[PDB]
């Protein structure tokens, strides 16, 4: 179906299929030498050079080697530099180059590759859509937006562009404008629209505007395997971890951490108040669009398993204390932070990204009335000097209706059933 052989390559088709036969038989090093031979003897042959690239790609998998993949990536480029390359082959080679650049994390190189592809193939909608993802992957949502706006001008019912356009709208807090794009997009069934991110955000946008259809989509996303439950909608998960919204210390096994937080709560409180009074800039406003209204700021000591040395200058004894507990300081999918919330604050229902952490809250300054936190179907209050533990991969919601500030200390821990192997290896979040 794909014509990958130019006029000259047809005259050596037999030698080309022989080396490709070797590659599909898994005979990778024999196949590497064979495509090298063809390359040295026919250095202009696009199909030969692609063969060498695909072998180097497979070898990078056999060896799990980034350096070998870096060479494959250059050879895929070489294919495109040669004369008389058939369009099917040029597109296959540059597409895979971009895919492997992203896999390594060269998202800026991927973007240049993708821009070239769109220039070479200006009627291919799927490439313009891939370019959008390129821009999303480097956090350039303004250029991604323009890309899917171009695509939707020409093909208004391209669903991939509709769910990605929705996602962007929603990230810009255009909740109502995003709901029809996400809904119609998912409903299109086009490749790339059955993704947990889009169910996640569609239901959340509906919850925000007050549409009881929201849980219809959470049910569906659950039915299609994106969510472990209708209530627990995290997307970076290890399957099989125990799942309950509220935990006791004993249930977690981190009883020594919990005792240290409760015994030494006042030194933690006092260092937080000192920062509020003399270094309030260390408290950064929440910036994940989780607030309906109000004021909510966090002062973070550890994130992604890494101590913030400047921040720990503002809470030095607290950071000394926590160092004894690698179940939190090495939780690379969690944080350690103070969190201040003031009256008139409502945090939208939301879910954290991963089921691999549990969240501890130590009460530090808790007004007598007006502060509560719901996780799933149960609402609780904090207590000064006491720890509450919840799984923030379950939906949860917070209110602050007191007459003065509420300060807590937040300590993320590795889910207790995760092995030491998993805790060393899971990518950070």
């Amino acid at each position: 179906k794909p014509k990958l052989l130019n006029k000259f390559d047809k005259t050596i088709k037999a030698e080309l299929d022989a080396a490709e036969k070797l590659r599909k038989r898994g005979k990778i090093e024999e196949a590497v030498n064979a495509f090298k031979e063809l390359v040295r003897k026919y250095p202009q042959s696009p199909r030969a050079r692609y063969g060498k690239a695909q072998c180097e790609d497979d070898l990078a998998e056999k060896r799990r080697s980034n350096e070998v993949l870096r060479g494959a990536i250059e050879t895929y480029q070489e294919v495109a530099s040669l004369p008389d390359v058939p369009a099917d082959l040029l597109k296959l080679s540059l597409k895979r180059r971009s895919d492997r650049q992203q896999f390594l994390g060269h998202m800026r190189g991927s973007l240049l590759t993708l821009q070239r592809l769109v220039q070479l193939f200006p009627n291919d909608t799927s490439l313009k859509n891939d370019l959008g993802v390129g821009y999303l992957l480097i956090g350039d949502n303004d250029n991604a937006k323009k890309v899917y706006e171009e695509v939707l001008s020409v093909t208004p019912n391209d669903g991939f562009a509709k769910v990605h356009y929705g996602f962007i709208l929603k990230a810009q807090n255009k909740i109502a404008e995003s709901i029809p794009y996400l809904k119609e997009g998912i409903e299109s069934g086009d490749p790339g629209t059955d993704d947990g991110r889009f169910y996640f955000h569609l239901g959340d946008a509906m919850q925000r505007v007050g549409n009881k259809e929201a849980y219809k989509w959470y049910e569906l996303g659950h039915k299609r395997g994106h969510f472990a439950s209708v209530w627990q909608r995290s997307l970076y998960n290890v399957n099989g971890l125990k799942a309950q919204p509220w935990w006791t210390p004993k249930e977690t096994g981190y009883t020594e951490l919990v005792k240290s937080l409760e015994r030494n709560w006042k030194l933690i409180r006092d260092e937080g108040l000192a920062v509020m009074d003399k270094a309030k800039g260390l408290f950064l406003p929440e910036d994940e669009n989780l607030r309906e209204k109000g004021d909510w700021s966090q002062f973070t000591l550890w994130q992604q398993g890494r101590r913030n040395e400047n921040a720990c200058k503002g809470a030095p004894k607290t950071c000394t204390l926590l160092e004894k507990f690698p179940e939190t300081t090495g939780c690379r999918r969690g944080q350690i932070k103070y969190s201040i919330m003031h009256p008139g604050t409502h945090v939208w229902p939301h879910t954290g990204p991963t089921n691999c952490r549990l969240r501890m809250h130590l009460g530090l300054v808790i007004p007598k009335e007006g502060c509560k936190i719901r996780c799933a179907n149960e609402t609780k209050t904090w207590e000064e000097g006491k720890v509450l533990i919840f799984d923030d991969s379950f939906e949860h919601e917070v209110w602050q209706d007191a007459s003065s500030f509420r300060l807590i200390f937040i300590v993320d821990v590795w889910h207790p059933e995760l092995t030491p192997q998993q805790r060393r290896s899971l990518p950070a979040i």
Binding site: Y236, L290, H350, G352, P427
Partner: peptide
């Protein structure tokens, strides 16, 4: 841009290879 309390980024992990 990182996913701390939510799922607002397009991707929450950072691709850095094998």
């Amino acid at each position: 841009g990182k996913c701390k309390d939510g799922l607002g980024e397009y991707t929450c992990t950072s691709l850095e290879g094998f």
